[PDB]
Amino acid sequence: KRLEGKVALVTGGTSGIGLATAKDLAAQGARVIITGRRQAELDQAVAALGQGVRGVRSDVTRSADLDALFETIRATEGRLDVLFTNAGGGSMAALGEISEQHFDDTFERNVKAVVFTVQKALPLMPQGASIILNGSIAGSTGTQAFSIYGASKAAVRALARSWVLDLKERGIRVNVVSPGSTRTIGLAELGGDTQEGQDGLLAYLASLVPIGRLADPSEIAKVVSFLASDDSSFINGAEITADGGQAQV
Amino acid sequence: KRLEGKVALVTGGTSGIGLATAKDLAAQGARVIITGRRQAELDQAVAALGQGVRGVRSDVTRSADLDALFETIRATEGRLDVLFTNAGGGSMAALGEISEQHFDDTFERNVKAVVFTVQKALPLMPQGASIILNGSIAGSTGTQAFSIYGASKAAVRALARSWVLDLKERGIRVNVVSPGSTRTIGLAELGGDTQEGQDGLLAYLASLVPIGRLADPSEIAKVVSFLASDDSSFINGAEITADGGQAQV
Amino acid sequence: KRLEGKVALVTGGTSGIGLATAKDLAAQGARVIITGRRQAELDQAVAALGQGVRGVRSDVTRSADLDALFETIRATEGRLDVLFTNAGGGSMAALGEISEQHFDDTFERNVKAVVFTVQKALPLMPQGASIILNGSIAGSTGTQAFSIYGASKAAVRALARSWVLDLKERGIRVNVVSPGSTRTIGLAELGGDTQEGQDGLLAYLASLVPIGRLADPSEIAKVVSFLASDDSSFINGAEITADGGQAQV
Amino acid sequence: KRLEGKVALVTGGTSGIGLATAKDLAAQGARVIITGRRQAELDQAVAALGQGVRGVRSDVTRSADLDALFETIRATEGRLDVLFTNAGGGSMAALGEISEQHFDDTFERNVKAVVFTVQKALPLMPQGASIILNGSIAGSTGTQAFSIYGASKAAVRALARSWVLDLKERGIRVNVVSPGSTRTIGLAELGGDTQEGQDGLLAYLASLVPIGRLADPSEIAKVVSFLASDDSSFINGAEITADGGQAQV
Numbered sequence: 003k004r005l006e007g008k009v010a011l012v013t014g015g016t017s018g019i020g021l022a023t024a025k026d027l028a029a030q031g032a033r034v035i036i037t038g039r040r041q042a043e044l045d046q047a048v049a050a051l052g053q054g055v056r057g058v059r060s061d062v063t064r065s066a067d068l069d070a071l072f073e074t075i076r077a078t079e080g081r082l083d084v085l086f087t088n089a090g091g092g093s094m095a096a097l098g099e100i101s102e103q104h105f106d107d108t109f110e111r112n113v114k115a116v117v118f119t120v121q122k123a124l125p126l127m128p129q130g131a132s133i134i135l136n137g138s139i140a141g142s143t144g145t146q147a148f149s150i151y152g153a154s155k156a157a158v159r160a161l162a163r164s165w166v167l168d169l170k171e172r173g174i175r176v177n178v179v180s181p182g183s184t185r186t187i188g189l190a191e192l193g194g195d196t197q198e199g200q201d202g203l204l205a206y207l208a209s210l211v212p213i214g215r216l217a218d219p220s221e222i223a224k225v226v227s228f229l230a231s232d233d234s235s236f237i238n239g240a241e242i243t244a245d246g247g248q249a250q251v
Numbered sequence: 252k253r254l255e256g257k258v259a260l261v262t263g264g265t266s267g268i269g270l271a272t273a274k275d276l277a278a279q280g281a282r283v284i285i286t287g288r289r290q291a292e293l294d295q296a297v298a299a300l301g302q303g304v305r306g307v308r309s310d311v312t313r314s315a316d317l318d319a320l321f322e323t324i325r326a327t328e329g330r331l332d333v334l335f336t337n338a339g340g341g342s343m344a345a346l347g348e349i350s351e352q353h354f355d356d357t358f359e360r361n362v363k364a365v366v367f368t369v370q371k372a373l374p375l376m377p378q379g380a381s382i383i384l385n386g387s388i389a390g391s392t393g394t395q396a397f398s399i400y401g402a403s404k405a406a407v408r409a410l411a412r413s414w415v416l417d418l419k420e421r422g423i424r425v426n427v428v429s430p431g432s433t434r435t436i437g438l439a440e441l442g443g444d445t446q447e448g449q450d451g452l453l454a455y456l457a458s459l460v461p462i463g464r465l466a467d468p469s470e471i472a473k474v475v476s477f478l479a480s481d482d483s484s485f486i487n488g489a490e491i492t493a494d495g496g497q498a499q500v
Numbered sequence: 501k502r503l504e505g506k507v508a509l510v511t512g513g514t515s516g517i518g519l520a521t522a523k524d525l526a527a528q529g530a531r532v533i534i535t536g537r538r539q540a541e542l543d544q545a546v547a548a549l550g551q552g553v554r555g556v557r558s559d560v561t562r563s564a565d566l567d568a569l570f571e572t573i574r575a576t577e578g579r580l581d582v583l584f585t586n587a588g589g590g591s592m593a594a595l596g597e598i599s600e601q602h603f604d605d606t607f608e609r610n611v612k613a614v615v616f617t618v619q620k621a622l623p624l625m626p627q628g629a630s631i632i633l634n635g636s637i638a639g640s641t642g643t644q645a646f647s648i649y650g651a652s653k654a655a656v657r658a659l660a661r662s663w664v665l666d667l668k669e670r671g672i673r674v675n676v677v678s679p680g681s682t683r684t685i686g687l688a689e690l691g692g693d694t695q696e697g698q699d700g701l702l703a704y705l706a707s708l709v710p711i712g713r714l715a716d717p718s719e720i721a722k723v724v725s726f727l728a729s730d731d732s733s734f735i736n737g738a739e740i741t742a743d744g745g746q747a748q749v
Numbered sequence: 750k751r752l753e754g755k756v757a758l759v760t761g762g763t764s765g766i767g768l769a770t771a772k773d774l775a776a777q778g779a780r781v782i783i784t785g786r787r788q789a790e791l792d793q794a795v796a797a798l799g800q801g802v803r804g805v806r807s808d809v810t811r812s813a814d815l816d817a818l819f820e821t822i823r824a825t826e827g828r829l830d831v832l833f834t835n836a837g838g839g840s841m842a843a844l845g846e847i848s849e850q851h852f853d854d855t856f857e858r859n860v861k862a863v864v865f866t867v868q869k870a871l872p873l874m875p876q877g878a879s880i881i882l883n884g885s886i887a888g889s890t891g892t893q894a895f896s897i898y899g900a901s902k903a904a905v906r907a908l909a910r911s912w913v914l915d916l917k918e919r920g921i922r923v924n925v926v927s928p929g930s931t932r933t934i935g936l937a938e939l940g941g942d943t944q945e946g947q948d949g950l951l952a953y954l955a956s957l958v959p960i961g962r963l964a965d966p967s968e969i970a971k972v973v974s975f976l977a978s979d980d981s982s983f984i985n986g987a988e989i990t991a992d993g994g995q996a997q998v
């Protein structure tokens with residue numbers, strides 16, 4: 003198929019966008035490795051995906067986990083063709099009530115972990131490999147009480163610009179998918195643990211999208227799969243925004 | 252079989268990016284209509300493409316030609332699923348030597364014709380159709396003696412932002428592919444008609460690209476096909492830039 | 501003080517932002533020339549402002565008007581230090597109801613006239629002169645039924661990027677002020693001719709602004725004066741957006 | 750004396766842009782507090798600046814220093830009208846050779862310290878106060894071996910977008926000055942410690958600027974003073990780029 007003969011890694015691939023992307027990449031022929039912190043959900047995801055998908059329990063914020071994750075790839079597949087640095091998250095905190103670890107937590111996972119996931123992956127990635135960073139429209143817009151999340155995603159987008167030049171000798175292109183609001187557990191949890199709070203939040207966020215609906219995670223995965231394929235061969239350092247129009251308007 | 256059962260129109264599909272795009276769309280199963288001003292080159296492209304591609308001689312800057320083009324589609328295919336407003340061009344003119352004709356010619360084909368191609372197409376386009384405008388990194392960068400071309404391409408990008416909202420009810424999404432330097436007769440012709448000049452310019456423009464090469468026209472076409480397919484269902488008003496890094500760096 | 505001795509031209513300086521800007525430039529010591537199509541409103545603006553402001557009846561869309569205007573400046577003041585290509589406007593037209601005259605009128609005044617205002621100005625402008633284009637947040641956002649106006653303002657913004665390079669040897673910098681919603685006759689007229697309609701539209705546009713009010717034209721004038729001053733000596737090709745948060749959030 | 754009666758704080762005001770800005774703010778009537786880690790350079794800056802400038806030795810990355818800094822302001826001046834988060838820096842590190850310490854150092858001073866400088870200042874800032882974050886064109890461009898610095902500055906720009914909304918009720922506006930290459934010790938040090946190497950780098954970076962020169966730190970300062978004044982009353986969440994054209998082309 004389109005991505006057949008390609009080895010893809012998705013950090014945080016047991017839920018939400020990571021899971022849908024792993025599903026889509028596998029359905030295009032890739033051998034897929036997914037990661038996640040919780041063993042139970044990791045195993046359930048790997049079973050649901052079938053298709054020679056492979057799981058590793060690993061935390062992207064722990065340098066040693068990253069090392070172990072990639073040695074597993076060197077020993078098994080021997081190379082990495084596609085890298086989707088999906089693992090990320092965010093919470094609400096207005097200016098005036100931002101705690102030091104609200105900052106550290108967001109930036110360690112959303113930014114620092116991306117830098118080192120990419121850096122440790124490089125020895126496994128051949129000429130023509132494709133790296134997809136996970137950004138967000140939050141990186142180029144303003145949302146009340148999400149400055150730190152926004153700042154973290156803008157940092158992600160900027161890294162890809164400079165990495166064009168750092169990876170040019172290596173022949174590896176780096177692009178960013180920036181989703182708008184996507185129906186995931188992640189997003190819903192911003193509504194709290196109440197079903198009504200999640201439902202209310204999800205319905206409010208759908209009303210902000212010009213086309214008036216949230217994305218299904220499979221609609222984000224399609225963008226990643228395109229960037230993973232050789233069809234994106236002349237795209238480098240670019241931000242592809244799939245937001246139903248929200249940030250372009 | 253991605254665009255199977257889809258009717259696609261490419262204005263200016265007899266050379267360069269339009270031709271490659273028509274080939275690629277068609278290689279996905281699409282029924283393709285191409286246009287062009289010169290009958291010979293049009294006939295020549297239609298024969299080379301085979302595949303139930305159909306040609307119409309029409310100038311996008313002529314209102315009556317547009318009317319005739321779309322009557323032809325109404326009479327034959329009966330609908331339009333994919334629209335690529337590819338017809339466009341540009342020439343060099345520094346500020347201080349910009350003629351009124353230089354301005355009118357650029358903006359009439361690159362901007363005005365796009366507005367009226369889209370508007371005349373609308374009665375043929377069902378819920379879920381996809382429009383692709385042809386932009387350029389020139390629209391978001393500065394290039395000496397190309398102000399008028401740049402301004403025109405920036406205007407094209409802005410149109411899609413508002414058209415998200417104008418076409419929300421009709422369920423039609425509008426996106427922009429913004430190529431960097433793609434080898435094409437158009438591009439080469441900026442060097443003049445001599446072999447020395449075309450080769451020099453083409454090699455100069457390749458040295459500006461971080462990955463160090465011009466785009467093959469097919470590399471742009473793959474983006475349009477992605478935008479044309481249902482994979483792009485949550486992309487609206489977005490600019491997808493395929494420039495090898497040049498405008499992102 | 502800051503503009504003491506400087507000769508400034510404001511096209512379309514008989515109302516709104518142009519008028520307020522002419523006032524502010526004069527209050528900073530500049531000799532200001534304002535223009536307008538209507539003699540009565542021109543005469544009243546010149547009289548109301550006093551402060552050594554001078555009026556010329558001229559249409560920016562008429563080449564011969566542009567020539568006579570600049571001949572007036574050569575014979576009277578002998579040079580031009582500051583150019584504010586303010587004269588502009590817009591009207592509503594959804595995609596599906598855009599007339600050729602709606603397109604031509606918008607782009608002739610908003611884009612073409614800017615190009616040729618600047619080009620005819622260049623022989624009067626010394627090293628270190630300052631050009632200010634009037635853009636708009638509509639150029640980087642989407643607004644239902646204002647696609648053509650938006651497109652024209654995006655084109656203005658792009659022009660400045662290329663003109664940095666066209667004007668480098670002449671030492672003339674070019675920047676763009678992009679106002680958000682500003683309380684002018686221009687803006688009110690979008691509400692119709694009834695006072696009720698103007699109040700409704702104006703309060704609606706104010707609710708779109710993060711800080712919750714429209715700009716007074718003097719607040720846009722301050723930005724132009726800053727760009728006109730020598731303080732902007734390291735600003736070139738830039739867009740300064742004064743919108744109360746609306747396009748930045 | 751646009752800033753007469755206004756209390757301004759400039760973090761990292763003993764050299765370069767911070768020092769020039771403190772000088773310019775002071776020259777407009779402001780009571781200026783500057784900070785710095787080194788006592789000798791701080792003392793020298795206060796003596797050279799005179800004009801009712803006040804110095805405090807404090808590290809923006811140490812929470813306790815910030816607390817002491819702002820208590821001194823509460824006890825002495827009793828309010829803060831203008832905040833310039835200037836203290837910042839960066840060094841080169843290509844992808845493949847980025848250390849955890851290089852990442853932490855850049856992001857702790859350039860981003861984290863900015864967040865908490867702003868947050869601790871807020872109780873001292875009245876309605877109508879003005880915050881200026883110090884960005885960089887690096888935040889929106891690609892530079893080989895400067896991915897981490899670039900990422901940090903894009904994060905800074907992003908922070909202001911959301912802080913528009915967080916600070917609405919408070920009536921405090923937040924904008925970003927983004928310098929291009931500006932002749933500071935900071936920039937020079939990127940050439941190393943030898944005079945030859947610093948001179949070489951400074952001339953190379955001057956050749957990257959369209960207008961062919963580095964900025965004097967006073968040229969950046971004028972932008973900050975403008976944002977600090979009431980002239981910027983309708984500017985909020987905006988990025989003012991003073992780059993001689995480099996990131997606009």
Ligand SMILES: NC(=O)c1ccc[n+]([C@@H]2O[C@H](COP(=O)([O-])OP(=O)(O)OC[C@H]3O[C@@H](n4cnc5c(N)ncnc54)[C@H](OP(=O)(O)O)[C@@H]3O)[C@@H](O)[C@H]2O)c1
Nearest residue numbers: 014016017018019039040061062089090138183184186188
């Ligand atoms: N959903 C949206 O609307 C949206 C919009 C824009 C951007 N994004 C971005 O898209 C990405 C995915 O978001 P999502 O909504 O799909 O999130 P999600 O459903 O909440 O979680 C996705 C996955 O991330 C894993 N994960 C979390 N922290 C991890 C860590 N430190 N190491 C490894 N795996 C980790 C989770 O498994 P464990 O918890 O077991 O580790 C889970 O499998 C994030 O970068 C997010 O910021 C989302």
Ligand SMILES: NC(=O)c1ccc[n+]([C@@H]2O[C@H](COP(=O)([O-])OP(=O)(O)OC[C@H]3O[C@@H](n4cnc5c(N)ncnc54)[C@H](OP(=O)(O)O)[C@@H]3O)[C@@H](O)[C@H]2O)c1
Nearest residue numbers: 263265266267268288289310311339387430432433435437
């Ligand atoms: N090539 C690049 O590097 C590059 C980069 C960015 C953007 N673009 C844009 O991509 C588009 C295609 O460029 P290209 O380089 O492929 O151009 P091209 O090879 O020079 O010509 C493209 C096609 O446009 C047709 N055409 C021209 N004027 C027309 C008109 N008035 N009505 C109908 N058809 C017309 C031409 O046929 P006839 O002459 O027979 O009419 C030809 O088939 C243009 O919008 C261009 O600005 C190109």
Ligand SMILES: NC(=O)c1ccc[n+]([C@@H]2O[C@H](COP(=O)([O-])OP(=O)(O)OC[C@H]3O[C@@H](n4cnc5c(N)ncnc54)[C@H](OP(=O)(O)O)[C@@H]3O)[C@@H](O)[C@H]2O)c1
Nearest residue numbers: 512514515516517537538559560587588636681682684686
């Ligand atoms: N107001 C806003 O919220 C806003 C926002 C963003 C951008 N802008 C831009 O700012 C500029 C001023 O807008 P405004 O609201 O102040 O407009 P306005 O109140 O309608 O005043 C515009 C001025 O332009 C003059 N003018 C119009 N067409 C002209 C022509 N062809 N030649 C010479 N002078 C001409 C008009 O005088 P005559 O009619 O007598 O010729 C009048 O003095 C425009 O470019 C507009 O697009 C405005």
Ligand SMILES: NC(=O)c1ccc[n+]([C@@H]2O[C@H](COP(=O)([O-])OP(=O)(O)OC[C@H]3O[C@@H](n4cnc5c(N)ncnc54)[C@H](OP(=O)(O)O)[C@@H]3O)[C@@H](O)[C@H]2O)c1
Nearest residue numbers: 761763764765766786787808809836837885930931933935
């Ligand atoms: N120069 C450029 O071309 C350029 C371009 C874009 C952006 N910028 C940004 O502009 C700002 C100023 O840069 P610059 O070139 O003027 O820098 P600089 O000359 O290298 O130093 C600026 C000042 O920052 C102080 N400082 C450094 N670390 C500090 C800390 N942790 N806490 C408090 N004060 C601290 C220094 O004093 P001590 O060492 O004594 O603490 C010094 O007085 C930075 O944010 C920089 O990233 C500069």
